[PDB]
Design a protein around this ligand. Structure first.
Ligand SMILES: Nc1ncnc2c1ncn2[C@@H]1O[C@H](COP(=O)(O)OP(=O)(O)O)[C@@H](O)[C@H]1O
Ligand SMILES: [Zn+2]
Ligand SMILES: [Zn+2]
Lengths: 283, 654
């Protein structure tokens, strides 16, 4: 047995079931959903994409709903999407090189080991706007439909905390730890010991890219007395300059929460958490 | 120091409090098994999220103890006080004894119960909110009170936190949003958790490692927090405003605030009669730091339960008595004209128009094209006519009885108060919008008076509404195409007060038919003497002014509670149209078209019948079928439709 704390999610079993569903999916949903030639629905994606060098992929929910061995995966990518996807990004490279074993190739292997992978669940179970998200169901794969009002500029974020020691012709380096930096006050004791002598430069460090988008919500049902809302969210890098004003959109993401400061002055906060959404895919 | 904080005592005794409670929590069998405990089994089944508290049952167990000669040991007399302390005692009494899950946990259930069972203060172990509700005095008078419907103005200060019921009206509530009750702080190094507790609006976070293993440690590895382990529960506010008939003389009434949490946040919508229940409670404000003398308090109240004398349409479901109500209603017969008799009997006669209002309430039937369009089952009505005759009793009875109802004047704040606003919200930085008179109505009713006196703008908007149920705006922030789904009922007078019998209604009336084509119905209600009819008119007027009781017919027109009941149940069907009626309707259309065109281009001639005329005939025939409560249409109805249509203008010819 292997398992995560507060969780019912196996890594390697998910990998195996993922792989078996992956080797086995042939327009099943045509069969099991309805009455509606071809073969191995998914696998063609994964055969074609290799020579073109892309670290992305899209994905339905229904094809899990169709295949036998994926019905439990549905409720688990649902509840733990970033975790289930931290799995699947590994299971995907695993399936890649377990599928390359049947092939001899020119030496493209200098890259795929250096590569990353990521997924995009798009056509998913419907959700009823915003009002439904009483706090029971925060942080979950979600879908929505609406249009655009306002676009912000780019938020950067420290991604490599560079650090310049003051002496001993030495730099220093340290990375982010659940979204903070803990500056090493010390001075690398061996060469020099000045327990709070170090500096900081930005031009060195690595920056993320984040953007926020104002959106207007356009449901299919509303209650007795309803009216528009305007929601903000967060997209991140490699998705920038995609969605803007003048577009209706069907979308997905994750609903979440966050507090804000009382000021630019101290750490005293609000009992009530401003809500938002982090982004997973856009249609 | 016994000077500060000296000793003192009361009759309050928590030791018997807890035993009394927890014996009550299990001795309930008078109204599965101990159904309170069966509900607990449901809670173990994760069926509900909020426990319910009946209190006449607590009275009844005190009656048990009394009848058995036990010290009944009354707590309600205390619980009506200081309720904010009782809540975290009741929760402890239940956590003490929650039965076991008769069903199993799985991957398809609440994602929280799994973590509960994984790690299997006490506040984060609570999978259950509580929301009280007080007694209705009908039972307090059984065996022999405390909380009557009270005012924004009649607090009397001393009623802070005591048990109370307030009435009034909700203007504006913000949207529901989440708020902490308990933090989940975990350690990087110790691997252990910390429970930082807040009840204020604010706090200051806990950064340095005060952990229990780091206590016995030089180094103090940093801790951080969760986004799921940390407890949450929502927080939403609402403003009552006071009821008219209880404002004293010449007095401008005033405002109030309430706070709600969690489950019941969805049972409130602006514009309704309400009886909020709960407790009126303080909070930290002192004015603003110059006009002060210390100890000052801004304040609020606790939400725990909502009743409203106005039952919206989506709360309908039959049972073993209301179906009996509909039965004995339908049994008498003459049901249609009986209704249109019972509509506002304060005013005399004109059953044809009472019937038309009834049909406006029905609205019609919604139909979808399935090709990117639908069409309204909705009505729009008007009652042109001279003054003198009654006009406004109608609209006031309407907004009295119909829910989601609205009155406006003609002129005044018609510029935007029929339209969408822009506003910042108090409890949270956000740019909310609340709408005019109409948008508070949707799937409901409006009323208007002195239409002719209104602006060209109101005409521009209503010319949209009557046909299409949207509103379009291009002024500022608001760029919507907003949904109305409303039902118009205006009124006005002609240009000369009394009619011009030597001019046409198409000249005598002030409004254009470029709009009035949308007006599927139109009555012309003018008055000419007669020696005999006005005699018993005065009889009617005089008997009603003698005592409010209407004429002593062998007949009982009935409350609007029951009336909205029947309307809601008849709103449930969606009947069908045969061809046997379709063809006859087609022929009548062609008849009226050619007849009105070639003949009525003359003295007493209004325009020309339209497709909209036909569509309205159809909608109203549907409604007749909805009232008979059969899913098809009889030929016996279209006759009443066209009868009433050509009847509307009979008095144009006398
Ligand atoms: N047929 C009637 N029976 C009894 N009272 C009437 C009748 N017609 C008018 N009235 C009285 O005269 C008044 C008429 O006002 P109304 O016609 O409703 O508004 P407006 O004249 O501004 O359109 C009412 O207060 C009503 O009590
Ligand atoms: Zn150094
Ligand atoms: Zn520690």
């Amino acid at each position: 047995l292997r398992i995560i704390w507060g969780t019912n999610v196996s890594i390697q079993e998910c990998t195996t079931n993922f792989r078996n569903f992956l080797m086995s999916f042939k327009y099943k949903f045509r069969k099991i959903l309805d009455e509606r030639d071809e073969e191995l629905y998914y696998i063609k994606q994964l055969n074609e994409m290799r020579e073109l060098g892309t670290s992305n992929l899209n994905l339905d929910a229904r094809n899990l709903l169709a295949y036998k061995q994926t019905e439990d995966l549905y409720h688990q990518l649902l509840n733990y999407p970033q975790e289930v996807i931290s799995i699947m990004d590994q299971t995907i490279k695993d399936c890649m090189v377990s599928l390359i074993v049947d092939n001899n190739l020119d030496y493209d292997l200098d890259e795929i080991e250096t590569k990353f992978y990521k997924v995009r669940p798009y056509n998913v179970g419907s959700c009823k706007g915003m009002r439904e998200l009483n706090p029971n169901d925060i942080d979950k794969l979600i879908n929505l439909k609406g249009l655009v009002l306002r676009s912000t500029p780019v938020i950067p974020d420290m991604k490599v905390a560079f650090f310049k020691c003051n002496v001993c012709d030495h730099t220093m380096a340290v990375e982010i730890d659940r979204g903070v930096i803990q500056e090493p006050a010390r001075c690398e004791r061996i060469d020099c010991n000045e327990p709070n002598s170090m500096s900081l430069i930005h031009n060195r460090c690595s920056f993320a890219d984040k953007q926020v988008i104002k959106l207007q919500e356009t449901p299919d049902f509303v209650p007795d007395g309803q009216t528009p809302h305007s929601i903000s969210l967060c997209v991140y890098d490699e998705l920038v300059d995609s969605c803007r004003a003048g577009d209706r959109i069907e979308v997905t993401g994750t609903f979440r929460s966050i507090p804000i400061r009382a000021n630019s002055r101290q750490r005293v906060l609000k009992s009530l958490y401003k809500t938002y959404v982090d982004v997973v895919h856009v249609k | 120091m016994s000077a500060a904080l000296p000793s003192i005592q009361l009759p309050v005794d928590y030791n018997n409090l807890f035993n009394e409670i927890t014996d009550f929590l299990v001795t309930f069998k008078q109204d599965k098994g101990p159904k309170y405990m069966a509900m607990l089994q449901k809670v173990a089944n994760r069926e509900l999220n909020s426990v319910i508290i009946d209190l006449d049952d607590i009275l009844q167990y005190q009656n048990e103890k009394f009848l058995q000669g036990t010290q009944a040991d009354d707590l309600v007399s205390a619980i009506q006080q200081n309720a904010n302390h009782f809540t975290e005692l009741f929760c402890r009494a239940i956590d003490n004894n929650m039965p076991l899950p008769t069903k199993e946990i799985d991957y398809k259930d609440d994602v929280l119960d799994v973590i509960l069972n994984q790690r299997r203060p006490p506040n984060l172990t609570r999978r259950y909110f509580l929301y009280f509700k007080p007694l209705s005095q009908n039972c307090a008078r059984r065996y022999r009170i405390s909380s009557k419907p009270l005012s924004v103005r009649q607090i009397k200060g001393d009623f802070l936190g005591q048990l109370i019921t307030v009435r009034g009206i909700i203007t504006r509530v913000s949207d529901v949003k989440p708020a902490v009750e308990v933090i989940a702080y975990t350690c990087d190094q110790c691997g252990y958790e910390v429970f930082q507790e807040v009840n204020s609006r604010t706090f200051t976070p806990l950064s340095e490692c005060t952990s229990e293993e780091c206590s016995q440690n030089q180094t103090k590895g940093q801790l951080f927090m969760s986004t799921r382990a940390s407890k949450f529960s929502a927080f939403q506010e609402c403003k009552i405003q006071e009821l008219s008939q209880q404002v004293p003389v010449g007095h401008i009434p005033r405002s109030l605030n309430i706070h709600v949490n969690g489950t019941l946040v969805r049972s409130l919508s602006p514009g309704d009669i309400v009886d909020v229940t709960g407790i009126f409670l303080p909070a930290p404000y002192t004015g603003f730091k110059a006009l002060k003398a210390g100890l000052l308090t801004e304040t609020y109240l606790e939400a725990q339960f909502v009743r409203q004398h106005k039952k919206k349409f989506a709360s309908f479901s039959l049972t073993s008595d209301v179906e009996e109500r509909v039965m004995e209603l339908i049994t008498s017969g003459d049901v249609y004209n009986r209704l249109a008799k019972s509509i506002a009997p304060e005013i005399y006669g004109n059953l044809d128009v009472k019937k038309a209002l009834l049909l406006l309430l029905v609205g019609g039937v919604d139909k979808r094209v399935g090709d990117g369009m639908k069409i309204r089952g909705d009505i729009n009505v008007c009652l042109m006519g001279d003054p003198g005759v009654a006009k406004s009793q109608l609209l006031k009875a309407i907004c009295k009885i119909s829910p989601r109802g609205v009155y406006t004047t003609g002129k005044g704040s018609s510029g935007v108060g029929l339209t969408a606003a822009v506003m910042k919200d108090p409890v949270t930085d956000e740019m909310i919008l609340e709408g005019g008179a109409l948008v508070l109505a949707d799937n409901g009713i409006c009323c208007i008076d002195e239409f002719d006196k209104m602006d060209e703008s109101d005409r521009t908007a209503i010319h949209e509404v009557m046909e299409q149920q949207t509103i379009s705006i291009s002024k500022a922030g608001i760029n919507t195409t907003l949904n109305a789904r409303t039902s118009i009922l205006a009124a006005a007078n002609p240009l000369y007060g009394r009619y011009n019998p030597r001019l046409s209604p198409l000249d005598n009336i002030n409004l254009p038919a470029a709009l009035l084509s949308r007006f599927d119905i139109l009555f012309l209600m003018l008055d000419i003497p007669s020696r005999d009819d006005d005699e018993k008119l005065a009889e009617h007027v005089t008997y009603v002014h003698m005592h409010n009781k209407q004429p002593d017919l062998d007949f009982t027109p009935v409350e609007p509670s029951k009336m909205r009941e029947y309307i809601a149940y008849a709103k449930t069907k969606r009947p069908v149209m045969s061809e046997a009626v379709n063809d006859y309707v087609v022929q009548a259309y062609i008849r009226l078209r050619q007849d009105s065109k070639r003949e009525m281009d003359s003295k007493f001639s209004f325009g020309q019948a339209t497709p909209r005329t036909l569509l309205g005939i159809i909608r109203l025939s549907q409604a007749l079928a909805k009232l008979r409560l059969a899913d098809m249409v009889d030929i016996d109805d279209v006759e009443e439709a066209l009868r009433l249509v050509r009847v509307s203008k009979e008095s144009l010819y006398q």
